[PDB]
Amino acid sequence: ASKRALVILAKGAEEMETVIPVDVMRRAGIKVTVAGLAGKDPVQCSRDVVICPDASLEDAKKEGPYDVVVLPGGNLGAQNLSESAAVKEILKEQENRKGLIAAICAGPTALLAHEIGFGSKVTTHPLAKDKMMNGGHYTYSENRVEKDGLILTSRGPGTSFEFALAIVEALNGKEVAAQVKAPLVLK
Amino acid sequence: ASKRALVILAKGAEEMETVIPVDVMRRAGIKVTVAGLAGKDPVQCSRDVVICPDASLEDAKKEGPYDVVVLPGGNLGAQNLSESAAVKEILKEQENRKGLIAAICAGPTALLAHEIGFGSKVTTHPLAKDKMMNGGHYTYSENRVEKDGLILTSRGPGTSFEFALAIVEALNGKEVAAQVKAPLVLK
Ligand SMILES: [Cl-]
Ligand SMILES: [Cl-]
C-alpha cells in the first residue's frame, strides 16, 4: 500500500515550499493530497502563484489518516494554518497516532500555535526563530533539516529539496530517496 | 520601469522549474506574467500540481515585449512548447529584438524545435542532451547554468534557484540577486 501525504495549502503559503515537497514526494510514489485549508478553490500563494488544491481539507481529512502531514511556510500561510481549529485537530490526531509531521520555514510556528511537539528539537527560517522560541517550548537547531522523532522541520525555500527528501527517506527509506534524487541535478 | 518576464506554462511542465523562477523573479521586483500556452485555464503539470496562469499566452503577447521569455522543462511541457507555432513566433521575435531567452531541463529542446539560437553554447537535463544535440545545432555544456549571449540554459529542478538567480542577475544586476538570495537559505 503506497504511503500517503497530506499537504495543507493556505492562502499566502510559500509556493516553492509547497510545490517542491509535493513534486518530490510524488516522484517517490507517495500519494499526495494537496488540501486547501479554505476549500477546493485555487489558492493565492505568497508570490502570487495560484495553485489548485486536489480537495478541501474537510474532504481530505475524511480520507485519512496520512503517513505525514506537511505544513509549508510563508508568513501569511503559517498565520492562516496557526489560526485554524481544523488544523489543530489534524495535528493533534497525527501526534496521537504517532504519525510524522513535517513543517518548513514559518510552517513550524503553526506547531507552536497548536501546542504540537513541545520539547522537540526544531529548526525554522532564521527570521522565525524568535517567534518559535517564545515561551521556550522547543530546543532550537541550526541544521538545514532537523528530525526529532516524528517532528521534522526545515528552514526555507533553499532547504526544500533536503526537507522533501528527508520525508521520502522517513516514509519510503534511503534507497527510494536516492532513486528520486538521481535525476534532480542537486549540488 | 520594472523589468518584465513572460513564463510560458504548458500542460506537463515541470512544476518546480515553473514555480521557483516565478517566485525568485517576483522577489527581485520583476513583473512576471505566467502565460498559459492553452489559454487562461488551470494547467496540470508533470507531477499533477495544478497552476492557474495569470493570462492566456494570446493576451500576454499583446502586453509585450518582455525582458525575458522563460521556458520551464518537463517532458510533455517541452513537447507542447516545441509544437506551438505561437511559441515559435514569440521566441523568433525575442531573438530579433535581442531579448533574453531562458530555458531549463527539457525546455531548451523547444529552442531546437523552433530553430532558436543555433550556434549557442547550451546545457540541458543530462537525459535531454542527445535530443538537443541531434543535428549539431549547438555546443553542449555541463555547467549547471550556461549563458551564451541572450541564450540562458540550465539543467534540472536542482539547478532552478541558480537558473532563476542568473535571470535576476541578467535583468536587475548582481546586487539585487544577492538581496533576493539572502533569505532563501541556499547552500
Ligand atoms: Cl545509491
Ligand atoms: Cl553582497
Give the number of other CB atoms < 10 A from CB of residue B129: 16
Laid out side by side, the sheet with A145-148 consists of A55-56, A31-36, A4-9, A68-71, A100-104, A151-154, A145-148
Residue A146 belongs to domain with CATH number: 3.40.50.880
User: How remote is the CA of residue A160 from the centroid of ligand 2, in Å?
Assistant: 23
Give the number of other CB atoms < 10 A from CB of residue B152: 26
Residues in chain B whose Cβ is within 8 Å of chain A: 14-16, 19-20, 22-23, 26-27, 34, 42, 46-52, 125-127, 144, 155-159, 161, 183-187
A27, A126, A185: residue with CB nearest B158: A185
Quote the CA–CA distance of B146 and A73 in Å, as a whole number: 31
Quote the CA–CA distance of B8 and A186 in Å, as a whole number: 24
A121 class by beta-carbon count within 10 Å (0-12 exposed, 13-18 middle, 19+ buried): middle
Q: Say whether B114 is catalytic.
A: no
Backbone angles phi, psi at B11, to 5 degrees: -50, 135
In sequence order, which residues have a C-beta less than 8 Å from that of residue A3 and are 6 or more positions away?
Answer: A29, A30, A31, A67, A68, A171, A172
The C-alpha torsion from B174 through B177 and B179 to B185, rounded to 10°, is -130
The C-alpha torsion from B168 through B172 and B173 to B176, rounded to 10°, is -80
Q: How many CA atoms lie within 13 A of A17 on its CB side?
A: 37
Report CB contact under 8 Å: A144, B185: yes
Instruction: Provide the grid cell at B136.
Output: 549539431
Resolution attained, angstroms? 1.8
Contact A38, A5 (CB under 8 A): no
Handedness of CA B104, B108, B114, B117 (dihedral sign): positive
**The one-letter amino acid at A56:** S
How many angstroms away from the CA of B79 is the closest CA of chain A? 19
Instruction: Please state whether beta strands B68-71 and A68-71 pair in parallel, antiparallel, or not at all (unpaired).
Output: unpaired
Strand, coil or helix: what is B173?
coil
Q: DSSP string spanning chain A?
A: ---EEEEEE-TT--HHHHHHHHHHHHHTT-EEEEEETT-SS-EE-TTS-EEE-SEEHHHHHHT---SEEEE---HHHHHHHHT-HHHHHHHHHHHHTT-EEEEETTTHHHHHHTT-STT-EE---GGGHHHHHTTS-SEE---SEEEETTEEEE-SGGGHHHHHHHHHHHHH-HHHHHHHHGGG---
Residue-number span of the structural domain to which A146 is assigned: 1-187
Laid out side by side, the sheet with A50-52 consists of A43-44, A50-52, B50-52, B43-44
Backbone angles phi, psi at A56, to 5 degrees: -70, 155
Q: DSSP string spanning B106-123?
A: TTHHHHHHTT-STT-EE-
Handedness of CA B58, B63, B64, B66 (dihedral sign): negative
Task: Work out how many domains chain B is built from and give that number.
Answer: 1
The experimental method is: X-ray
In sequence order, which residues have a C-beta less than 8 Å from that of residue A1 and are 6 or more positions away?
Answer: none
